[PDB]
């Protein structure tokens, strides 16, 4: 069992890389209402098949590349 985060693709313009916006819905550090604060992350993808507007699941390693440690483990749903 692995602990994995989900998000939406925001760029795919790289033959081995994507950019993802994580579905991070959290309570504010000093206020009580839950808010969207979606992390924009650089993620490894060696199938190069998913594109902008897709829904994805990610796992953490290991540092993989420059300032990157997360990789694609499931394409959850296609655009639109």
């Amino acid at each position: 069992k692995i602990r994995t985060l989900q998000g939406r693709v925001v760029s795919d313009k790289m033959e081995k890389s994507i950019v993802v916006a994580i579905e991070r819905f959290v309570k504010h550090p000093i206020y009580g209402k839950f808010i969207k604060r979606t992390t924009k992350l650089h993620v490894h993808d060696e199938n190069n098949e998913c594109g902008i507007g897709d829904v994805v699941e990610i796992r953490e390693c290991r540092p993989l590349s420059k300032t990157k440690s997360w990789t694609l483990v499931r394409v959850v749903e296609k655009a639109v």
Partner: protein, 123 residues
């Protein structure tokens, strides 16, 4: 505030800052003194008042109050200055110390002998 407010702009504190800033958070400092002046009685309060121009150790030049009967203060005396307001004068925030240096004591004093410079100067 609503459940959506203060989220983008959190509440930011208003700072008041020092009333006696020329002393730089110290209680008392030396001042050389250059000029002595007198001022007008304030409407119903029938007495004339005395003040001086004093440069401090840190280079600030401020208006110092002179309380008590009698004064020997002049140009380059080198005397001790304190924080002390006078609510009968416009903007008077600084006061003089009698118990130190060139300064003569207050005349006719015999009570409250720890203040007012009642102890004789050295010669």
């Amino acid at each position: 505030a609503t459940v959506n407010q203060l989220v983008r702009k959190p509440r930011a504190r208003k700072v008041a800052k020092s009333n006696v800033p020329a002393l730089e958070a110290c209680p008392q400092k030396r001042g050389v003194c250059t000029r002595v002046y007198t001022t007008t009685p304030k409407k119903p309060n029938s007495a004339l008042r005395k003040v001086c121009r004093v440069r401090l150790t840190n280079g600030f030049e401020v208006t110092s109050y002179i309380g008590g009967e009698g004064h020997n203060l002049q140009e380059h005396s080198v005397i001790l200055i304190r924080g002390g307001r006078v609510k009968d004068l416009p903007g008077v925030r600084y006061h003089t110390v009698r118990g130190a240096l060139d300064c003569s004591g207050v005349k006719d004093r015999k009570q409250a002998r720890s203040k007012y410079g009642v102890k004789r100067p050295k010669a």
